[PDB]
Coordinates of C-alpha atoms in Angstrom, one line a residue:
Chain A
X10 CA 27.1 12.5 39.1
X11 CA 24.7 9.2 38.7
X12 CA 27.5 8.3 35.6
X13 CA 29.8 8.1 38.0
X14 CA 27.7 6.6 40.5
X15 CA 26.7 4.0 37.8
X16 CA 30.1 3.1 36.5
X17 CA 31.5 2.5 40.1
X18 CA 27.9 0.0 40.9
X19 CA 28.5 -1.4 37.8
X20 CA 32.9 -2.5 39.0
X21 CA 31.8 -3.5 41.7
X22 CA 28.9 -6.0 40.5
X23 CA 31.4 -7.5 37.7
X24 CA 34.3 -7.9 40.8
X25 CA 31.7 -9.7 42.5
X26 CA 30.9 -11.7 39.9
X27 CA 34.5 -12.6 39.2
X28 CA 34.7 -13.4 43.0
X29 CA 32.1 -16.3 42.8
X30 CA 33.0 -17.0 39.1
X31 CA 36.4 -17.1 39.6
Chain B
X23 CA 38.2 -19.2 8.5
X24 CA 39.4 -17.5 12.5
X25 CA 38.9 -19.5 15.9
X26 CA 37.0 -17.7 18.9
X27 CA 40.3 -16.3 19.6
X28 CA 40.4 -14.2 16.0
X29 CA 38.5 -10.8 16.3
X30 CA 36.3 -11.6 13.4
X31 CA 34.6 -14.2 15.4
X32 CA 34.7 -11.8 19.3
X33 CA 33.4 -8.8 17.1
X34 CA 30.6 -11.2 15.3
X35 CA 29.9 -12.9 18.4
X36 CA 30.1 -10.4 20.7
X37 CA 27.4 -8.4 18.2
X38 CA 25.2 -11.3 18.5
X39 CA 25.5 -12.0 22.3
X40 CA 24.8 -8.1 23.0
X41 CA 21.3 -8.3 20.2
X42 CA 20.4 -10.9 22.0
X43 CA 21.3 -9.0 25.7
X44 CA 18.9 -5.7 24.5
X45 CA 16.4 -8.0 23.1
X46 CA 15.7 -10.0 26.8
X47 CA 15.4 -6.4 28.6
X48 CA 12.9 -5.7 26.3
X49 CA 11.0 -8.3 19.2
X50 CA 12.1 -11.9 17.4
X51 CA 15.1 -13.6 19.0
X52 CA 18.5 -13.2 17.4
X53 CA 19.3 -16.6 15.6
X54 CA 21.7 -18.4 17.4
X55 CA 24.2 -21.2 17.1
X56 CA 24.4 -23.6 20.2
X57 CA 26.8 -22.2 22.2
X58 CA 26.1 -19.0 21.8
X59 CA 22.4 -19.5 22.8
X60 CA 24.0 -21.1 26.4
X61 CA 25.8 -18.0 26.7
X62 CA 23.1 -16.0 26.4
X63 CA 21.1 -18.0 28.8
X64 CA 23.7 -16.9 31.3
X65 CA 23.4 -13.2 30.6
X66 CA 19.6 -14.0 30.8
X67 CA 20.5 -14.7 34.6
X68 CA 22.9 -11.5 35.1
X69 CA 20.6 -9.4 33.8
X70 CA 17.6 -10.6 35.7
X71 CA 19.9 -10.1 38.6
X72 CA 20.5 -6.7 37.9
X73 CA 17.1 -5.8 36.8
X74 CA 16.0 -6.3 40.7
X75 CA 18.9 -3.8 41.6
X76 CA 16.6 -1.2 42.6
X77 CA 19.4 1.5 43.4
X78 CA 21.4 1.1 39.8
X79 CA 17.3 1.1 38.2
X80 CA 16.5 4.4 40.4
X81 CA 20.3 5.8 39.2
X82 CA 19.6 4.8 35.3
X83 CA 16.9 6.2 35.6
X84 CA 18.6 9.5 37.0
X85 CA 21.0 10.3 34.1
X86 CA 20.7 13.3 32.1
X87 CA 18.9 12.4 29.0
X88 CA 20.8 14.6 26.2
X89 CA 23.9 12.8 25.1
X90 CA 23.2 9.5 25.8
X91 CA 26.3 8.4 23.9
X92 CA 28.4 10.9 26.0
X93 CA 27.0 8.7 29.2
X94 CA 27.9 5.4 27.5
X95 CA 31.7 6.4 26.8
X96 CA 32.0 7.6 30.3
X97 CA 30.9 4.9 32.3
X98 CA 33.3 2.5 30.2
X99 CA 35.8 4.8 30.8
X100 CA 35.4 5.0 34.6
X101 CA 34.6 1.3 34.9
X102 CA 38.0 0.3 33.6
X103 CA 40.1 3.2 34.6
X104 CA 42.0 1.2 37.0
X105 CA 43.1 -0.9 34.4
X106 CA 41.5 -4.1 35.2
X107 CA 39.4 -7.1 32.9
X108 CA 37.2 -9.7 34.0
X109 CA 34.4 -11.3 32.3
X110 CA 32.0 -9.9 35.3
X111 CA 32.9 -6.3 33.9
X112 CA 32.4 -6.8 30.3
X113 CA 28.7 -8.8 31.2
X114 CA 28.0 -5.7 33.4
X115 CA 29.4 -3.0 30.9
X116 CA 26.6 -5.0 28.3
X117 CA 23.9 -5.0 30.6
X118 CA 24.7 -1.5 30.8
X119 CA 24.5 -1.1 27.5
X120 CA 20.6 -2.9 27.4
X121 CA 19.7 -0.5 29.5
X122 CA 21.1 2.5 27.9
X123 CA 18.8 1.7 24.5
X124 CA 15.3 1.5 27.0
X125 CA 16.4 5.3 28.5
X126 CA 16.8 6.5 25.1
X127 CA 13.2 5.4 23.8
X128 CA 12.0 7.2 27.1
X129 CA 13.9 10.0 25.5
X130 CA 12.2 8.9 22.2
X131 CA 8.6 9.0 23.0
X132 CA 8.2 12.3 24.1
X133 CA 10.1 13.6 21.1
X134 CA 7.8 11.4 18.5
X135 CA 4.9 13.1 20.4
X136 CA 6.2 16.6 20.4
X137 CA 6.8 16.2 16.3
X138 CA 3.9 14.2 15.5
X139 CA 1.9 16.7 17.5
X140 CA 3.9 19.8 15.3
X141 CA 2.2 18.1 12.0
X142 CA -1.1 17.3 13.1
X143 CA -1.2 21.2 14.4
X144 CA 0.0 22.2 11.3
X145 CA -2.7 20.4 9.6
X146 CA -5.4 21.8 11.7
X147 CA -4.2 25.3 11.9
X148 CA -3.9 25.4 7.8
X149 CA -6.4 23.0 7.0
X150 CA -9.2 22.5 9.3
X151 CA -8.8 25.7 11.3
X152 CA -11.7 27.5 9.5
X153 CA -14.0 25.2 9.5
X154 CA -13.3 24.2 13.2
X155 CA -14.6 28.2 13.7
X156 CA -17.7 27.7 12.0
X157 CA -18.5 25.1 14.7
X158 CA -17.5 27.7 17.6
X159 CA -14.3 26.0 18.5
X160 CA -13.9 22.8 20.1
X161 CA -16.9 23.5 22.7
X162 CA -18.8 22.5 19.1
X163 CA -17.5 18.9 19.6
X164 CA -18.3 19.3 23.2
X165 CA -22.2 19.4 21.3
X166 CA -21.4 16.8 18.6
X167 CA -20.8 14.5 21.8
X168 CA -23.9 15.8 23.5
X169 CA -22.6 17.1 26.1
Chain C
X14 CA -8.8 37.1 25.6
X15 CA -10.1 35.1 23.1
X16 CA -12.9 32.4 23.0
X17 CA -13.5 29.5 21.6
X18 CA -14.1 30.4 18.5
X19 CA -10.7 32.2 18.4
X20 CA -7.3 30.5 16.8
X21 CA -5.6 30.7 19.8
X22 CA -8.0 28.6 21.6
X23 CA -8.5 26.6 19.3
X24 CA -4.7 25.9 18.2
X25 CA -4.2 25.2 22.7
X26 CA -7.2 23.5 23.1
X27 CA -6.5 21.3 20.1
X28 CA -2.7 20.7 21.2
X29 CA -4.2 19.4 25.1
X30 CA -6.4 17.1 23.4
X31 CA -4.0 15.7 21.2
X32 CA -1.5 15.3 23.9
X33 CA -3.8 13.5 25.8
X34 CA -5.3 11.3 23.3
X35 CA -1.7 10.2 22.2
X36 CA -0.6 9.3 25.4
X37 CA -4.1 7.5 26.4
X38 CA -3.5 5.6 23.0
X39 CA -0.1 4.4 25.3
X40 CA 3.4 8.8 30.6
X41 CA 1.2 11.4 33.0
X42 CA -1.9 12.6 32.4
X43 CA -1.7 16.1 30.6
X44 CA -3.8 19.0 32.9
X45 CA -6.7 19.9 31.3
X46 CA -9.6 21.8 32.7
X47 CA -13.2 20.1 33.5
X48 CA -14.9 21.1 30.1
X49 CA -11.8 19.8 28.0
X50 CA -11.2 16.3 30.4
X51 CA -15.2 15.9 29.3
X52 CA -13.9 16.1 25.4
X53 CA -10.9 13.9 26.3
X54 CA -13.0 11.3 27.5
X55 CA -15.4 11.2 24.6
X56 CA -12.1 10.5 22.5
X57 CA -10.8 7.8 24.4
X58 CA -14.1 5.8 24.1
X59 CA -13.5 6.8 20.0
X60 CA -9.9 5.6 20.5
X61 CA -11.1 2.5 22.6
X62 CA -13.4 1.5 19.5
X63 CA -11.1 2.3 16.5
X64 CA -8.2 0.4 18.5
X65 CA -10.2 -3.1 18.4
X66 CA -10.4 -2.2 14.2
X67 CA -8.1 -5.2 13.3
X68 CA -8.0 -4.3 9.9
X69 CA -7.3 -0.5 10.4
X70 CA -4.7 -2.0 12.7
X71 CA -3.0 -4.5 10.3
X72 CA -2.9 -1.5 7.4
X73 CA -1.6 0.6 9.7
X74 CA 1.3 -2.0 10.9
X75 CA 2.1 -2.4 7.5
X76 CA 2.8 1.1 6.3
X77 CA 6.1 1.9 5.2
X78 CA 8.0 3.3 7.5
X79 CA 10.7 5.4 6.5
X80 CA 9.1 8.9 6.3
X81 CA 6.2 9.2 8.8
X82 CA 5.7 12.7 8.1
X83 CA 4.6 11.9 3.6
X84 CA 2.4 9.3 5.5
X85 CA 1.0 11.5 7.8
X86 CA 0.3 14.6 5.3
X87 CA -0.9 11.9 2.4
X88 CA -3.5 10.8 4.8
X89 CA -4.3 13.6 5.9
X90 CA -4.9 15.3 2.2
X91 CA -6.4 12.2 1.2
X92 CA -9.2 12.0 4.3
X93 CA -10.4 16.0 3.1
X94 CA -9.8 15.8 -0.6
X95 CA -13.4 15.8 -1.6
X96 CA -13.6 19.2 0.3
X97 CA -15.9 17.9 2.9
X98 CA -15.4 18.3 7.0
X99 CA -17.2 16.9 10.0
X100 CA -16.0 16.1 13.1
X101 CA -16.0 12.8 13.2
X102 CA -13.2 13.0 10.3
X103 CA -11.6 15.3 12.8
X104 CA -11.3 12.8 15.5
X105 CA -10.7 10.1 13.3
X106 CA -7.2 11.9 12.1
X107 CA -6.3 12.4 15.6
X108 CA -6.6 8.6 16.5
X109 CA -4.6 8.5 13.4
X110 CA -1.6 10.5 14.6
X111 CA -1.7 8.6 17.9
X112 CA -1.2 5.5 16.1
X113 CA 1.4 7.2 14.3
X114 CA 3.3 7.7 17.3
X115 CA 3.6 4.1 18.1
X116 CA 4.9 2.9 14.6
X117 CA 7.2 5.4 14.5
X118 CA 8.6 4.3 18.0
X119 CA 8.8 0.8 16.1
X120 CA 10.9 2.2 14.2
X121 CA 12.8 3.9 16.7
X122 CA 13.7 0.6 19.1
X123 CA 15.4 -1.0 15.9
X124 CA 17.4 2.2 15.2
X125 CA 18.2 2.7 19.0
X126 CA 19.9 -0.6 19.3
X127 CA 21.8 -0.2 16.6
X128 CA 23.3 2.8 17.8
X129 CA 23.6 1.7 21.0
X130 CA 25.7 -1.6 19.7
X131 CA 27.9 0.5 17.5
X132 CA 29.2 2.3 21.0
X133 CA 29.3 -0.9 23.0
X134 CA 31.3 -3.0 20.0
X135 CA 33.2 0.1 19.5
X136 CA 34.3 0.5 22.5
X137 CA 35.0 -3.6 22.9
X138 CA 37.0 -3.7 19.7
X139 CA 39.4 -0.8 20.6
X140 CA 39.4 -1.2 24.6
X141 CA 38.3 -4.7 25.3
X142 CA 39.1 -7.3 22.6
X143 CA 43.0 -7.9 23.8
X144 CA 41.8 -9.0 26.7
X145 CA 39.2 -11.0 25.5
X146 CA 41.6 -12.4 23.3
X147 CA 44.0 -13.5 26.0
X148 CA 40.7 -15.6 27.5
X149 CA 40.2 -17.6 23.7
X150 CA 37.3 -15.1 23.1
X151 CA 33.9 -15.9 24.2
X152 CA 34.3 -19.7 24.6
X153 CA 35.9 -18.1 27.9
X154 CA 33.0 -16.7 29.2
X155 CA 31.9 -20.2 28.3
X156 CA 34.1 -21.3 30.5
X157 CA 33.6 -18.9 33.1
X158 CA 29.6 -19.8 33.6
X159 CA 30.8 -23.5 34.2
X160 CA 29.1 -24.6 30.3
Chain D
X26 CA -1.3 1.3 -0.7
X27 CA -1.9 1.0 2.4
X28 CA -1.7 4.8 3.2
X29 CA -4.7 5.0 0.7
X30 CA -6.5 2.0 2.3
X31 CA -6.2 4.3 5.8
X32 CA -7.1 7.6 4.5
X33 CA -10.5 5.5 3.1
X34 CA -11.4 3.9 6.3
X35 CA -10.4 7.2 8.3
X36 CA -12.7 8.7 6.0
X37 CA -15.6 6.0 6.3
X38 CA -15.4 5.7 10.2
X39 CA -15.5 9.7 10.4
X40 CA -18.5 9.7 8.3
X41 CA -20.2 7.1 10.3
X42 CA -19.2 8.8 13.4
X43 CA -21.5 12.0 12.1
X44 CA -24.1 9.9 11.2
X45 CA -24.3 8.5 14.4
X46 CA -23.8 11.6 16.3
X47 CA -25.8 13.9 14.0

């Protein structure tokens, strides 16, 4: 399911932005 | 009279910050105080970022149109299922959000052409209709144009 | 079996040009066979013109825009009230329906947001704002961009 | 009202149209 697909893109981005961020 | 820490000020704030979000992906610029602005030149960056993700564009684009509010609970669900916060998640749970209102139009348009459509017909067929035979049908305009 | 002079032509003909004029006034092209693609691009040099009508285009920008249907069907009865038809009224009311499409929409982008917000502050309030709370709110994120 | 205003010019430009094309 793209929903799915899309809410795990959209962890990943925002743990990668913590990583650099943070 | 609540600090940044009151939720008065997260819910009024966060309203404005996410306005302001939708209204970049995109008329008039949410009014802004200061600080908020620099925040929102931030999300300005994030979102351009994302913008160029071509697989979560091509995947947006995938989702089943009907219920988009039954997509938006269900990716926030799933994104913090595992129990976790950080401000990258909530920026990318908002761009999400952007997103979601420019997939809904594409819903939209479609929809306003398919009613719009229904009255102008309606019109035509109880209006216009006998008149339009008088002319032959629409091969009479074909004349009116000369061709 | 019908020809052109018959309803049901007329009604399916009418619909394909509509379609098509409403989306040249903006996604694909609707299919439409050679004689009716010659009709479609006599109205898109009638659209063309009637586009670059600034005034027609300020009036029509400043309609009211709660109930496009009493606007459409007021126009409408208003264009044929003195009993008279001619097909260059005809076209003239389908240019105005394609434009109707458009305000409508700007109608729609406001509502959309809204909507959208609701779920996303909704969702923040009940699921999100302890957390944010725990940061000082937003001046966090402040924080967390470096400002 | 502005919906009159339209339905006038609609009128007028249709008009013109036929005179034009007839």
């Amino acid at each position: 399911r793209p929903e799915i697909w899309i809410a795990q893109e959209l962890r990943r981005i925002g743990d990668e932005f913590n990583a650099y961020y943070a | 009279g609540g600090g940044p820490t009151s939720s008065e000020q997260i819910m009024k704030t966060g309203a404005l910050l996410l306005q302001g979000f939708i209204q970049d992906r995109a008329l008039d610029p949410v009014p802004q105080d200061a600080s908020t602005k620099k925040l929102s030149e931030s999300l300005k960056r994030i979102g351009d970022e994302l913008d160029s993700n071509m697989e979560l564009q091509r995947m947006i684009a995938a989702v089943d149109t009907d219920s988009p509010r039954e997509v938006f609970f269900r990716v926030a669900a799933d994104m913090f299922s595992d129990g976790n916060f950080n401000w990258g998640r909530v920026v990318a749970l908002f761009y999400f959000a952007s997103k979601l209102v420019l997939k809904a139009l594409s819903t939209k348009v479609p929809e306003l052409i398919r009613t719009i459509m229904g009255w102008t017909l309606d019109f035509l067929r109880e209006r216009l209709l006998g008149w339009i035979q008088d002319q032959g049908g629409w091969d009479g305009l074909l004349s009116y144009f000369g061709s």
